[PDB]
Symmetry: C2
Subunit: 321 residues, 2 copies
């Protein structure tokens, strides 16, 4: 149901078209520098933040708080289908050199812990060149592949070069072919997405299927991470570290009627006692402390909360200050 | 009949495939299994290759994994002229031995197709056609294959007009285009080695080398002027046998002495001109030819001799030469005046002049 979901979404973009305009199936358009229109049916045409804080104090429980913070931050169908199209425009540019190739989004854009206004990560799947120029047992004629890493750095370098000079929207391009997982980041003007592309690593689509299955395995999972992160930001250790500990904290429990209010509070209580590879299995001292500090403090606030409410700091909002 | 010829030749390479092989009819018996097969031919750059042209071709691509006559593509020429039976049979041998051969001609039209393939990724309906010394009729074997990429698009539209990167000057557009193509040839483009960008010359170009064929290639983008220079001469070389025969030999003559070289001298194109010139100032102007589209029995022997005699005094121009080193031009006439004498008297004929 994940591999499946992506394909209905990808096929979706293929019939979608992004149109720029002045200022005047289902159709939906958005804003940025002008008014852009997303339209889906072909070659038939070509041929011719803080306000959130204050909005929580009007909810009628801590549990209704997490659920608002999640609603306001999580991606929206529009946006979701808009970064799938972006992937499609790219996949178009890369399908010139590499015919049947797929660029599909991954990470925070596809699991369920995607926040609005984040990075669109893209993974270019290739399953080199195929010309008239053959070689003989007939076999296509390619440029000898020393390591599959260089082949990455190359590929990315050319796509990179193409995006930059002739490829609409694509700006702020920059190559980073030397970082363990070589990548190329640019920016698409028509959408405001910080995007990044990589080539050889089916590991990210496998990291993003996990969380997918967790975020959709139970409502509260999405609710709890979205708030811990937000808590965490409000005050190193990576957004992925936390998330883990949270799916973790969720297993080391256990049907389970617990409330977000209770669950949240038990989050901090539980962690009262570098690497996302050292202190947590691959699925700064001063820092981790200040985390438990926060953890232990963010505990007591909710302790009073229950032990001992209006439109001045309460429940969650007390924890985002 | 030029624009025309180029298209049949291009369509021709489209159905042509270039195969690399070890070193051994079982072989056509093979390829035959993907459809007929017009002609075909061998040749060997730094290995042995097959150039096969089918009668489509997608099916062969669907067939992959993960005692033979080679069709040839200098000094011995000197000695071979001394066995011809007249000075006129000399110019016509020197011309046959040096001029391009169907094989080669169709081999550099295929190379253009493999390139055109790499640039039709970015620019769909683009054509890369060869030009210059590879297309007129004055092309000598083993010369430069010059190519011209003619350009006449995403979902991402703008309002209904496509969305492009703003074109500052059409010269930068060129420089950019050539840079990407250039980047692509170098890294992932089979055979294409020794690549090098030259984007600052007045005609920006990118030169490389194709291993599979030994061609020194060169690509440029915006200039229909070369396809217009090359049609002129075309019509000249084909307008009368002797033209081809005469230039091929004055060039050779030229090269033989420290004259026409591969800097600041006098270019193989200069000469050629003077010769088409020399040929009109006898008993067809590029005017009554450019805008529009007489017998003369002279022999090559006579013609050639009168070439040097005519440039014995050559305060006058010659429509430097109009576009249709002092010490050097002199040593030219020196040679001109001497290379006359020799034919005046009684190694022989031409070969006397190539020494």
């Amino acid at each position: 149901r994940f591999s499946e979901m992506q394909n209905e979404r990808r096929e979706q973009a293929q019939r979608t078209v992004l149109i720029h305009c002045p200022e005047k199936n289902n159709h939906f358009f958005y804003e940025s520098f002008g008014l852009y229109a997303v339209v889906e049916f072909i070659g038939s045409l070509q041929n011719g933040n803080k306000q959130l804080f204050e909005l929580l104090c009007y909810a009628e429980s801590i549990d209704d708080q997490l659920n608002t913070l999640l609603k306001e931050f999580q991606l929206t169908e529009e946006n979701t289908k808009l970064r799938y199209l972006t992937c499609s425009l790219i996949e178009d540019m890369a399908a010139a050199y590499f015919p049947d190739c797929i660029v599909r989004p991954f990470g925070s854009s596809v699991n369920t812990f995607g926040k609005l206004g984040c990075d669109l990560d893209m993974f270019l799947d290739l399953d080199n060149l195929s010309a008239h120029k053959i070689s003989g047992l007939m076999e296509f004629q390619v440029k000898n592949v020393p390591s599959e890493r260089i082949a990455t750095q190359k590929i990315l370098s050319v796509l990179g070069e193409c995006l930059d000079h002739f490829g609409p929207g694509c700006v702020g391009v920059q190559k980073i072919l030397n970082a363990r997982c070589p990548l190329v980041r640019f920016s698409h003007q028509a959408s405001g997405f910080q995007c990044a592309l990589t080539t050889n690593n089916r590991i990210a689509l496998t990291s993003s299927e996990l969380l997918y299955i967790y975020g959709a395995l139970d409502s509260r999972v999405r609710a709890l991470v979205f708030s811990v992160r937000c808590w965490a930001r409000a005050h190193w250790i990576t957004n992925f570290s936390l998330t883990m500990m949270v799916i973790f904290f969720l297993q080391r429990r256990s049907q389970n009627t617990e409330t977000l209010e209770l669950l949240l509070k038990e989050f901090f209580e539980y962690f009262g006692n570098x690497x996302x590879x050292x202190x947590x299995x691959x699925x700064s001292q001063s820092q981790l402390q200040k985390f438990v500090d926060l953890a232990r403090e963010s505990a007591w606030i909710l302790q009073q909360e229950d032990t001992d409410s209006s439109n001045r700091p309460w429940g969650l909002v007390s924890l985002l200050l």
